Amino acid sequence: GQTALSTVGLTYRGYDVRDLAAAAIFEEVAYLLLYGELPNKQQLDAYLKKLQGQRDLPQALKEVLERIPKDAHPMDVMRTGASVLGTLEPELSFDQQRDVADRLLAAFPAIMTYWYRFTHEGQRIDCNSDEPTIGGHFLALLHGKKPSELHVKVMNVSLILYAEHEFNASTFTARVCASTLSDLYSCVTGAIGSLRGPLHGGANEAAMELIERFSSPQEATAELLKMLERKDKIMGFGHAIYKDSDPRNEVIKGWSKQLADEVGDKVLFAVSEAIDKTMWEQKKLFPNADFYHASAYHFMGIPTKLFTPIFVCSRTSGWTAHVFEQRANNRIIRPSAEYTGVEQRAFVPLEQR
Amino acid sequence: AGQTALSTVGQEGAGLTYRGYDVRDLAAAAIFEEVAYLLLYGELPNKQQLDAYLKKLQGQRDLPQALKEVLERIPKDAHPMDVMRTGASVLGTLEPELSFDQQRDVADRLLAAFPAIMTYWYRFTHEGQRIDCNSDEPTIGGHFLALLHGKKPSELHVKVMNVSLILYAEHEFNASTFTARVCASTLSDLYSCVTGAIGSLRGPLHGGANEAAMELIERFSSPQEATAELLKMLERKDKIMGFGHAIYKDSDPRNEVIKGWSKQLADEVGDKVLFAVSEAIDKTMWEQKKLFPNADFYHASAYHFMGIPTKLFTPIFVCSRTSGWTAHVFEQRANNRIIRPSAEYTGVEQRAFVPLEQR
């Protein structure tokens, strides 16, 4: 397998994810990955109007989401949505592949929030908003009110930071499916299922369950030192590839702080900083992208169980772009198994078992 | 890429074994439920075990109201594999796998319910009828034919459906089994692994070969016409679907079995074209290219003689291969080792951000 999409701090087709998150809206980054370049003002203006037109859900899909139980795993909602949308607006040929990628990016916010608000608040919601960005549109659908400019900014920053990350289990699942020449909806449905597993997804959710235990930074440091001596895994720390830092941590940390200031938080961000300082002093371990993402989402009023669903809204851009590469250059390992079972044996009839 | 005890393909002696038993002995002497039990539970079941397994599967054939109402909203011209994908995704929200302790109960539910998910959608959209998802047939093979045709199937038709489901049940590592194990390696739920596997099997480099064989053999009104047209397709270097294999050297053990049963079905229904056309293409492929037919080739005629629409062929393979897929997921859960090779970077070197104005 070859890729021109990203490499390890972290670049997207040569561009530092830090520069992108500072100076770009998510749509500029989705365009870069799916279409090959940062878009000029004409292309960006056309792109934005195309996506603003792809936000509403078909009536049949609304009626399906209404039958998924309130207590369902939200990732099964995202899986089921992608699967049903594939039967209503099919990818008849690979010529439609960029149009379908765009449709998923524009619709996923409505699939999540139409289900959530129907089952939790008993409202059937309008799936269009007045926000021109996906990041704003999401917050408009989730809370049914105009978001603050700060909260629209932090949503755009998060979608950019998580958009693409080389190869991992979900991106690999998308490529294996792609390699049989299956449709784009299959490759996304499979990638969502792999992300559902707790060894791959749920990290920012687990970071949130850790920081929410502690009523002060004193109590947090005191309890962390006990966990570290007990050799407990600490969620949000360490990486398989980076060694000095995760470029994405740099960025989200500073936005989480501005949100703490905005909402007059006294506990949650202070607790996060105490854990971050302690991990460096005791283990020289830097925090990864998931750690400060949890406080930031919480400060914008997002239910913990929607964190990994928001990652799907972002990483759909990387996944689809990987499928386009696999279709154009269909190279991948073909797996064999080591047989460890029994030797060949005679058939035994029912009466002798 | 992993380790398995479920099956060996292309090795000396029996060409295909399931936990050491020859697939040709299983297809001759067993019902599918005996082979599903062997894969999921580890041994061939004894009489008391089989009796209780059949009773358990018999009570897991009906679909929840909410699932029926979802399938009513999938369009008539949808890909039937997208219907199987959607059905598994919805059933996982309604009857969740809360613990890996439930894993064999969820695999059993999928084997028992898949036939109703396929036929409830198909007959609602194609006939405007809401069907009963229960039947009086004791086996999955018979149950599928009772739901599809809405009447009692013949003994011969029930036996061939049982043979087909055994022949297609397991095949070591391949794209769909590998997809299920990658999903299993993240400790995702069993419904995720199956939904992922169906997606990979939808791709035409993996699924659909016995649908392609049907579209070839249905073109000819005489065996002599089939022979003359095949000689021209070979001149054009067209790929003939259902012939040769990437692993088997001399023959596919599943071919000799389904060919015999397709012949018996041809005699029963009074066919004098479709089996003769199939044999002519087989004989011509041997003489011209020494390529043997694989499992896909005689499956096309066998399914057609039992009145099955071509676009339901790969969905029947899903009903069968769910046994192999789920047994593979349990192995991955018990022994979580896999390789997922990283990619090589071939993209551009690092470059400065260009603000919007200068693009």
- Give the 3-state DSSP-derived string for chain A, with helices as H, strands as E and coil as C: CEECCEECCCEECCEEHHHHHHHCCHHHHHHHHHHCCCCCHHHHHHHHHHHHCCCCCCHHHHHHHCCCCCCCCHHHHHHHHHHHHHHHCCCCCHHHHHHHHHHHHHHHHHHHHHHHHHHHHCCCCCCCCCCCCHHHHHHHHHHCCCCCHHHHHHHHHHHHHCCCCCCCHHHHHHHHHHHCCCCHHHHHHHHHHHHHCCCCCCHHHHHHHHHCCCCCHHHHHHHHHHHHHCCCCCCCECCCCCCCCCHHHHHHHHHHHHHHHHHCCCCHHHHHHHHHHHHHHHHCCCECHHHHHHHHHHHCCCCHHHHHHHHHHHHHHHHHHHHHHHHHCCCCCCCCEEECCCCCCCCCCHHHC
Is A347 in contact with B25 (Cβ distance < 8 A)?
Answer: yes
φ/ψ of residue A84, rounded to 5: -70, -45
Nearest Cα of chain A lies from the Cα of B81 at a distance, in angstroms, of 10
C-alpha B28/C-alpha B252 separation (Å) is 16
CA angle B260, B262, B264 (to 5 degrees): 70
Task: Please name the helix (run of DSSP H) or strand (run of DSSP E) that holds residue B331, with its range, or none.
Answer: helix B313-334
Whether A328 and A279 share a structural domain = no
Identity of the residue in B5, B199, B356 whose CB atom sits nearest the CB atom of A186: B199
Alpha helices in B62-208 (DSSP H): 65-71, 80-94, 103-127, 140-149, 155-167, 175-185, 190-202
Resolution (Å) of this entry: 1.6
Domain membership of residue A61 (yes or no) is yes
Is B195 in contact with A189 (Cβ distance < 8 A)?
Answer: yes
Q: How many other C-beta atoms are found inside a 10 Å radius of the C-beta of residue A183? A: 26
Q: How many other C-beta atoms are found inside a 10 Å radius of the C-beta of residue B132? A: 13
C-alpha A234/C-alpha A166 separation (Å) is 24
Whether A166 and A191 share a structural domain = yes
A173 touches chain B (CB under 8 A): yes
Whether A64 and A122 share a structural domain = yes
Domain membership of residue B77 (yes or no) is yes
Q: List CB contacts (< 8 A) between A39 and chain B.
A: 359
Sequence letter at residue B140: I
Q: Write down the residue that tokens 């598994």 correspond to.
A: B88
Structure tokens at A171: 């991106």
A9 touches chain B (CB under 8 A): no
DSSP per-residue letters across B242-253: TB--SS-SS--H
What residues contact residue A347 under an 8 Å CB cut-off, 6+ apart? B21, B22, B25, B26, B29
Identity of the residue in B78, B199, B351 whose CB atom sits nearest the CB atom of A15: B351
Instruction: Name the nearest CA neighbour of A244 among A287, A180, A273, A206.
Output: A287
φ/ψ of residue B4, rounded to 5: -140, 150
Domain total for chain A? 2
Instruction: Name the nearest CA neighbour of A228 among A283, A302, A159, A294.
Output: A283
Domain membership of residue B261 (yes or no) is yes
Domain membership of residue A3 (yes or no) is yes
Whether B17 and B42 share a structural domain = yes
* Burial class (CB within 10 angstroms; exposed 0-12, middle 13-18, buried 19+) of A341: middle
Q: List CB contacts (< 8 A) between A48 and chain B.
A: none
C-alpha B329/C-alpha B310 separation (Å) is 30
C-alpha A57/C-alpha A77 separation (Å) is 14
B/e letters for B40-49, b = 16+ CB within 10 Å, e = fewer, are beeebbeeeb
Binding-site residue positions of A = 165, 239, 248, 315, 334
**Alpha carbon A45 to chain centroid, angstroms:** 25
Domain membership of residue B45 (yes or no) is yes
Whether B150 and B252 share a structural domain = no
Task: Give the torsion through C-alpha atoms of A335, A338, A340, A342, to 10 deg.
Answer: 80
Name beta bridge partners: A218.
none
A340 touches chain B (CB under 8 A): yes
Q: Do A33 and A318 form a contact (C-beta atoms < 8 A)?
A: yes
- Domain of residue A214, residue span: 202-300
Q: List CB contacts (< 8 A) between A15 and chain B.
A: 351, 353
Domain membership of residue B359 (yes or no) is no
**Alpha carbon A314 to chain centroid, angstroms:** 5
Structure tokens at A28: 């500029």
Nearest Cα of chain A lies from the Cα of B339 at a distance, in angstroms, of 9
Contacts 24+ apart (CB under 8 A), A181-184: A181/A327, A181/A330, A181/B203, A181/B204, A181/B205, A182/B199, A182/B200, A182/B202, A182/B203, A182/B206, A183/A86, A183/A90, A183/A91, A183/B79, A183/B202, A184/A91, A184/A97, A184/A100, A184/A101, A184/A104, A184/A320, A184/A323
Task: Please name the helix (run of DSSP H) or strand (run of DSSP E) that holds residue B320, with its range, or none.
Answer: helix B313-334
Structure tokens at A4: 């021109």
C-alpha B337/C-alpha A116 separation (Å) is 36
Whether B172 and B234 share a structural domain = no
Question: DSSP character for B227?
Answer: H
C-alpha B194/C-alpha B328 separation (Å) is 11
Whether A187 and A206 share a structural domain = no
Catalytic one among A102, A183, A276, A290? A290
Whether A27 and A126 share a structural domain = yes
Q: Do B203 and B83 form a contact (C-beta atoms < 8 A)?
A: no
Structure tokens at A320: 């689809």
Domain membership of residue A349 (yes or no) is no
C-alpha A257/C-alpha B78 separation (Å) is 49
Whether B84 and B186 share a structural domain = yes
Contacts 24+ apart (CB under 8 A), B12-17: B13/A344, B14/A344, B14/B253, B15/B248, B15/B251, B15/B252, B15/B253, B16/B171, B16/B253, B16/B254, B17/A344
Question: β-strands B2-4, A337-339: how paired?
Answer: parallel
B272 touches chain A (CB under 8 A): no
Name beta bridge partners: B164.
none
Instruction: Name the nearest CA neighbour of B132 among B335, B123, B140, B141.
Output: B123
The residue among B260, B282, B306 that closes a domain is B306
C-alpha A38/C-alpha A143 separation (Å) is 31
Whether A258 and A141 share a structural domain = no
C-alpha B99/C-alpha B25 separation (Å) is 36
Whether B8 and B114 share a structural domain = yes
Sequence letter at residue A288: N
C-alpha A70/C-alpha B273 separation (Å) is 55
Instruction: Name the nearest CA neighbour of A113 among A260, A279, A306, A288.
Output: A306
Whether B164 and B290 share a structural domain = no
Instruction: Name the nearest CA neighbour of B243 among B288, B179, B181.
Output: B288
Is A181 in contact with B188 (Cβ distance < 8 A)?
Answer: no
Question: β-strands A11-12, A6-7: how paired?
Answer: antiparallel
Q: How was it solved?
A: X-ray
Length of chain A: 353
3-state DSSP assignment of residue B3: strand
Q: Do A237 and A291 form a contact (C-beta atoms < 8 A)?
A: yes
Catalytic one among A143, A200, A239, A265? A239
Domain membership of residue B112 (yes or no) is yes
Mutate to test the interface with B, among A20, A196, A333 (most CBs of B within 10 A): A196
Question: DSSP character for B17?
Answer: E
C-alpha B197/C-alpha B327 separation (Å) is 13
Q: Do A81 and A131 form a contact (C-beta atoms < 8 A)?
A: no
First to last CA, chain B: 45
Nearest Cα of chain A lies from the Cα of B242 at a distance, in angstroms, of 17
Q: List CB contacts (< 8 A) between A339 and chain B.
A: 3-5, 8, 11
Question: For the packed helices B103-127 and B47-58, what is the interaxial angle rounded to 10 degrees?
Answer: 50
**Alpha carbon A326 to chain centroid, angstroms:** 21
Instruction: Locate the chain A residue with the closest alpha carbon to B31.
Output: A350
Length of chain B: 359
